[PDB]
Design a protein around this motif. Structure first.
Motif, mmCIF file in Angstrom:
data_model
loop_
_atom_site.group_PDB
_atom_site.id
_atom_site.type_symbol
_atom_site.label_atom_id
_atom_site.label_comp_id
_atom_site.label_asym_id
_atom_site.label_seq_id
_atom_site.Cartn_x
_atom_site.Cartn_y
_atom_site.Cartn_z
ATOM 1 N N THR A 1 4.093 -4.521 6.602
ATOM 2 C CA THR A 1 3.799 -4.764 8.007
ATOM 3 C C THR A 1 3.483 -3.432 8.692
ATOM 4 O O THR A 1 3.376 -2.392 8.037
ATOM 5 C CB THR A 1 4.968 -5.498 8.671
ATOM 6 N N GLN A 2 3.325 -3.450 10.013
ATOM 7 C CA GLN A 2 3.164 -2.243 10.812
ATOM 8 C C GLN A 2 4.420 -2.061 11.651
ATOM 9 O O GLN A 2 4.838 -2.988 12.354
ATOM 10 C CB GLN A 2 1.929 -2.332 11.709
ATOM 11 N N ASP A 3 5.017 -0.871 11.582
ATOM 12 C CA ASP A 3 6.339 -0.672 12.170
ATOM 13 C C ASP A 3 6.329 0.233 13.406
ATOM 14 O O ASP A 3 6.848 -0.153 14.458
ATOM 15 C CB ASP A 3 7.315 -0.202 11.071
ATOM 16 N N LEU B 1 8.015 -2.625 16.389
ATOM 17 C CA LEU B 1 8.437 -3.759 15.583
ATOM 18 C C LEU B 1 9.806 -4.257 16.039
ATOM 19 O O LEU B 1 10.682 -3.485 16.438
ATOM 20 C CB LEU B 1 8.464 -3.380 14.101
ATOM 21 N N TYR C 1 7.413 -9.035 17.867
ATOM 22 C CA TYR C 1 6.955 -7.762 18.409
ATOM 23 C C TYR C 1 7.397 -7.641 19.861
ATOM 24 O O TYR C 1 8.014 -8.548 20.427
ATOM 25 C CB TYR C 1 5.437 -7.638 18.273
ATOM 26 N N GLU D 1 14.757 -4.882 12.636
ATOM 27 C CA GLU D 1 14.366 -3.510 12.355
ATOM 28 C C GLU D 1 15.481 -2.563 12.779
ATOM 29 O O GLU D 1 16.295 -2.892 13.645
ATOM 30 C CB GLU D 1 13.063 -3.172 13.083
ATOM 31 N N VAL E 1 2.452 1.745 7.749
ATOM 32 C CA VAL E 1 2.963 0.653 6.929
ATOM 33 C C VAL E 1 4.472 0.794 6.790
ATOM 34 O O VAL E 1 4.999 1.903 6.651
ATOM 35 C CB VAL E 1 2.276 0.644 5.552
ATOM 36 N N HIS E 2 5.172 -0.335 6.831
ATOM 37 C CA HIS E 2 6.617 -0.327 6.663
ATOM 38 C C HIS E 2 6.991 0.006 5.223
ATOM 39 O O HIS E 2 6.151 -0.002 4.319
ATOM 40 C CB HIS E 2 7.201 -1.681 7.058
ATOM 41 N N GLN F 1 2.991 -12.248 14.514
ATOM 42 C CA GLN F 1 2.117 -11.766 13.452
ATOM 43 C C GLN F 1 2.466 -12.451 12.136
ATOM 44 O O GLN F 1 3.533 -13.048 11.987
ATOM 45 C CB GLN F 1 2.221 -10.240 13.304
ATOM 46 N N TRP G 1 -4.122 -9.734 8.568
ATOM 47 C CA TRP G 1 -3.171 -9.806 9.670
ATOM 48 C C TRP G 1 -3.852 -10.282 10.943
ATOM 49 O O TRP G 1 -4.883 -9.739 11.351
ATOM 50 C CB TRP G 1 -2.525 -8.440 9.889
ATOM 51 N N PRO H 1 0.790 -1.241 0.000
ATOM 52 C CA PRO H 1 0.000 0.000 0.000
ATOM 53 C C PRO H 1 0.817 1.284 0.000
ATOM 54 O O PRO H 1 0.230 2.358 0.154
ATOM 55 C CB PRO H 1 -0.787 -0.129 1.308
ATOM 56 N N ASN H 2 2.133 1.205 -0.149
ATOM 57 C CA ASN H 2 2.983 2.384 -0.138
ATOM 58 C C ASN H 2 2.944 3.095 -1.487
ATOM 59 O O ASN H 2 2.720 2.486 -2.536
ATOM 60 C CB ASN H 2 4.426 2.006 0.203
ATOM 61 N N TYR I 1 1.485 -12.009 7.566
ATOM 62 C CA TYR I 1 0.950 -11.111 6.549
ATOM 63 C C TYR I 1 0.475 -11.805 5.280
ATOM 64 O O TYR I 1 0.066 -11.110 4.344
ATOM 65 C CB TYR I 1 1.979 -10.053 6.141
#
Lengths: 117, 106, 40, 117, 106, 117, 106, 117, 106, 117, 106
Positions: F105-107, G46, G36, G55, F99-100, G89, G95, C14-15, G91
């Protein structure tokens, strides 16, 4: 057991129109592309048209561009080719043909109809 | 577009013999050349694809090879039901068939 | 196609992508390609 | 924990109408496609209809074309099949079905209802 | 549509045995054919998808393979909970199911 | 320095409507997709919604489908989430998310508001 | 949708101890699984993405690996400020988060 | 054997409009891209325009942007080029050209036409 | 855009002599460079494409090689029907031709 | 030889509007993407906007989102950047820039104009 | 977005020595990093792209290398027309320029 039949042939006066048909069975018709190869008796064959498996795009040889329309009906497993403005040199035995799975050749040909002008 | 040539355009041989059909083209291909067979009045059926690989149900007597602009189709131990008009084809551009070579019983 | 994949795809990226090539491409192959595999 | 239940079964007169429902839970019903598969008892199964996840596309078998209507209501997680002009040959056990993630196959079937004419 | 046939329609075996079921169909697929199980009075559940891969929850005893028009299901170390009617399915065109084969006690 | 703040939390009677917001700063908000993720205290989280960067696409969880509305405003760098006909089971902590870059993902999560019924 | 499972739900460990946390799923993914951390009352941040890559700003002590339906989180030589609840998690589909596991002082 | 000819030459006053044409034969015109390459006498060549095989997209050199319109018509295997607001520096011999098969070069050039101001 | 340079802009040689034409470009390409021929008053015809491969129909006398920003065209055993102006071309950006090198009798 | 110039600078009251222009020459302007990069005197640079070669897409930095409008004119080889509601922070030197052929960087910078608030 | 850092922010060196500039970034790139130059009062001009490839016209003295989160620019035999400020850039996300290192005469 891949079998194809063709119909709609006969004799049409020059400048007239004729619509061929190619019933199909023994193979996944919606999963393969279609060809129309015609053979003038006593001569070699010449490719005419190809239509993609989904029917999105379509090509023709230069001699038939702008006059021939090739369409598919996946529901009835039927292939069509609509000839408009028929002319004398098009008199030949048209053939239905299936695309090979691996390399885009033609593997099995239907018996085909004979069309005169 | 590509143009195809065959030679000889008429060949005579007997049963149990061994023959060749030469297919020459322009715009060198080396991969995408076929072979065919059309009995008199019968629809043509595939005989060799990719110029080296047989189609299912084709006897091992038929052999094809070649590259560049030079290709051959070799039949060993000619049998009576192989007497037909073998054609040629290419796929690198729009498909254009050859003129046709005939095998006639010596 | 009745057997086309009927599932939703919320996992697509979605970016925004401003970093794609903004240059024109005039020397891409302009020939027709009827020799692409026409099967499924 | 895919839980599917069907209701609306029973007996109807020939030529009448009946309306089926398929409540769903345990999965994101709002984004998955639905199937209806029926089984004549003592025989094999025969697919009836498919509805896309968004409800735009829908297909049916030829024997049921033009008589059966499949619809979705994503708000209440319920799948419908409007049944019109029922006949004696339509008596069978009807199943609700769930589309797989990878290929459009059917994974989880509800217990289903028996419809009699 | 695709025509689906299974053989044998009924088989007899004991516990701990090794059983196969043949699923034959026209309209060559080679990719997409399923396997199923239906206890009497119960809804069917998926067993093998893509004709080679198991669904989650299906034990390793179940296995399937095949291509073209020849597809088979292999069941090793037969267990009492497996005694049901295994069906067949394909997706390459409009879905059609087989006639059904039932495994019994010998 | 991705800073996210949320407001609009508090109490509301069942069946009412409440309007959240998520101000964003320290990153190009107009070029990123958003999310909403909620956690009931003492339990794990569950996804609620997603909105594409431009705003064309948007999904929802099955338990919130049709009742929740997610919207954006790129000019004001603000996220939104319109909830209508809120029910008792929805009491949880509401988080904003981003969003990453590479993998969707979620960051980075904002501190989030607390909502009850 | 995908359903997620973790074990152990609660674990006791000391400072400098090395522990692993198992994340087991259905419908094997092997690429799209997270890791997480959520301090009490704090928003989660993250920890590992693509289940193998850290990360930015995450110390090298954290390690993740796994494929199919089996995944683990590897933390080495535990620090006092790492005592929190690590969530899991995926994807591949919509989710879905795990149930939550907690690391506590011994 | 591929034959290309050009017409529509002559002399036109500056600021006027002139339309060229390039009939082609011996190859599948509908399946190949076109070009216009011009040569000022005694100088080197300079490219002018290109149009894709199907006629969707089209480009120009910077010195001719906005004044020249390059168009096809696959029915009669004809290539066109609509020149508007002709200027003195455009006096040159204009060549028709075909795109090569593998690499998007130019292979066969028509004999060209004379355009002066 | 790419700018093209040729050297020498005029060359003289006898019959049967061997000559070389150097084509230097900016913004190195290493693949996409052509060579041309234009007898006075006749439309140009392609001679070498991808800077190493001959167009069908030209003799083996013509030779091209090079990479980066430097390319050459070598003609061995020059014959009277080859005295013409050889151009240069590239495709990595908008096509811009060289200035033209002309071969004269000596 | 590529030459870029900028005009339309000067002084403007805060909250006003100003329109810059970037004339281009020596390269195919109609086939390249554009940029605007600014440098506060004595400080580092910061990107502002980008527009695709044909002008379909266009982006901005978050600090100028919704206030700046970037537009092109392929016929006149001229870039434009429309400024609305100028603030005292925006005082800096504004540069024109051209996208590199291979990699979407900025290759050649014009001398730039100076705008103050 | 990405955030960019260079060090040292100010460097002093004479003519003919060797100078290295370290450009560090978050969110490791390894491919898409530039190097720049801005004479006082002049528009900046590109020097290195992909952190290893020289823009046309830049002499061979300039050299760049690096991957991950760290990148370097190496200038050998510093010359009087090189005394300027070298910037830094990336292209994975929205373009952000670093602070800028100024080279001074010692």
């Amino acid at each position: 057991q891949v079998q194809l039949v063709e119909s709609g042939g006969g004799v049409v006066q020059p400048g007239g129109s004729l619509r061929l048909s190619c019933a199909a069975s023994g193979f996944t018709f919606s999963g393969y592309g279609m060809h129309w190869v015609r053979q003038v008796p006593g001569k070699g064959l010449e490719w005419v048209a190809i239509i993609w498996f989904d029917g999105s795009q379509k090509y023709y040889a230069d001699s038939v561009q702008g006059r021939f329309t090739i369409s598919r009906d996946n529901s009835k497993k039927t292939l069509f080719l609509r000839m408009n403005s028929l002319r004398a040199e098009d008199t030949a035995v048209y053939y239905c043909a299936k695309v090979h799975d691996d390399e885009p050749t033609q593997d099995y040909w239907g018996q085909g109809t004979l069309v005169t002008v | 577009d590509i143009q195809m040539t065959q030679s000889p355009s008429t060949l005579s041989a007997s049963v149990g013999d061994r023959v060749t059909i030469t297919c020459r083209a322009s715009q060198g291909i080396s991969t995408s050349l076929a072979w065919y067979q059309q009995k008199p009045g019968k629809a043509p059926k595939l005989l060799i694809y990719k110029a080296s690989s047989l189609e299912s149900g084709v006897p091992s007597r038929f052999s094809g090879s070649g590259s560049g602009t030079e290709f051959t189709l070799t039949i060993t131990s000619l049998q009576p039901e192989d007497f037909a008009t073998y054609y040629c084809q290419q796929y690198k551009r729009y498909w254009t068939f050859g003129q046709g070579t005939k095998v006639e019983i010596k | 196609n009745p057997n086309a994949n009927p599932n939703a795809n919320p996992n697509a990226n979605p970016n925004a992508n401003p970093n794609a090539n903004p240059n024109a491409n005039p020397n891409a192959n302009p020939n027709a390609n009827p020799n692409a595999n026409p099967n499924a």
